């Protein structure tokens, strides 16, 4: 129901709890809800 849907979604837990990320503090570095700054390297691996 319309009220039932509202009370159900109010019970529902968002996924944002498990995704600890925030603003880009730097162009190459991402922040975190716990101030754990992050940077991703895309590597073209060596031929083996």
């Amino acid at each position: 129901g319309a009220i039932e849907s509202r009370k159900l979604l109010a019970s529902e837990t968002p996924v944002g709890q498990f995704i600890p990320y925030s603003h880009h503090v730097t162009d190459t570095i991402i922040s975190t809800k716990n101030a754990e700054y992050l940077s991703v390297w895309k590597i073209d691996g060596r031929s083996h």
Binding site: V15, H24, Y37, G45
Partner: protein
């Protein structure tokens, strides 16, 4: 202001780390993902990788004033109860991981 001090010191340390790693990975690809702008609005290349990890599909992620966490996820995950696999519900399709 001391949180700003932590910000500045951490950024300097991480930039030093990235420079050292880039110098170490000369033989490898060694490409640093950074912000790329498209269409009069900024985008985040690193955000696309994290989204791919969490969403299971490559979705470009515009950078807006709100926090990255709230609008990162566009697919509903459904982890099984008493199971070893999970299902992602998406417009493109349903992905079982």
């Amino acid at each position: 202001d001391q949180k700003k001090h932590r910000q500045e010191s951490c950024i300097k340390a991480l930039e030093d780390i990235n420079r050292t790693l880039g110098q170490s990975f000369k033989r490898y690809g060694a490409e640093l993902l950074s912000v790329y702008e498209k269409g009069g609005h900024a985008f985040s290349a690193p955000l696309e990788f994290l989204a791919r990890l969490v969403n299971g599909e490559h979705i470009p992620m515009p950078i807006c004033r709100d926090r990255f966490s709230d609008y990162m996820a566009v697919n509903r995950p459904m982890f099984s109860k008493w199971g070893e696999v999970g299902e992602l519900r998406s417009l493109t399709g349903l992905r079982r991981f």
